[PDB]
Amino acid sequence: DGYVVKETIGVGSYSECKRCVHKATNMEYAVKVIDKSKRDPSEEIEILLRYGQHPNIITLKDVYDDGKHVYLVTELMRGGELLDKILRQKFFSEREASFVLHTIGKTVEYLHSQGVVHRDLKPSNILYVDESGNPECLRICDFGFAKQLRAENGLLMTPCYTPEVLKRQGYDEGCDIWSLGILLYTMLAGYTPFANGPSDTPEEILTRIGSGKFTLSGGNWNTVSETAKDLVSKMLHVDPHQRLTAKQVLQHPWVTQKDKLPQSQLSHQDLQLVKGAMAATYSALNSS
Length: 288
Description:
The PDB classes it as transferase. By secondary structure, this protein is of the alpha+beta class. It has helices spanning 42-51, 82-86, 94-113, 164-189, 202-211, 226-235, 246-250, 253-256, 271-287, and strands at residues 5-12, 15-22, 27-35, 60-65, 69-74, 116-117, 126-128, 138-140, 147-148.
């Protein structure tokens, strides 16, 4: 139960994530410390326990609860965040972008098919496990705001088995797809579609989202495939119920036919501007 707690990795609401190194074998891991009084991580643990073995989902190693705090010990994400790699020291083109979406898209398709929605698919919740930058090293993380589809009696249910009760998933699923849509945009454009920097205001961003318009022309978009633009447009459609499903995304020419994709380095703005814009976009969304 006692580890070797060291540096703090990140921070969050009612939870802190530090770098433990123990297992009585100097084995490095990550441990999320949730305040039992502040928050109840019932849904999160059950999701990680049931779906952690997925290779592109963060695997759960140990779990502890003394009553005051919970200790979710997971595999350590040494590769950092997705943007921290692709927009720094890694050759990134529509080809590499397609592999990234492919990897994450299948994971979401799996989760949606099991009736699990994430509802927090920000690029800071997608991390490499090692510093290779390889697609298979990707891991979806932080299932804090994730919800399993349950029955009236409280039994886990799939959308296959399962009117307005299901349309809730259809919305919640459509928001996960929309979250991937801005990541696709950001990957292609090198900048957030509804934010120009870290100091954008909720009033600015939410107006742009509601307008249902974004730049698919000018800048990087002049040297980007029409299939790449077709996908983002369909992924970021205004009505969440008219957006693509995770399956329909993966059946798209951009994703499937990777031979036809350009392999030229993509331009990007400073990482901190892009990271700044992105965190501000999700900050504006949390208000509404």
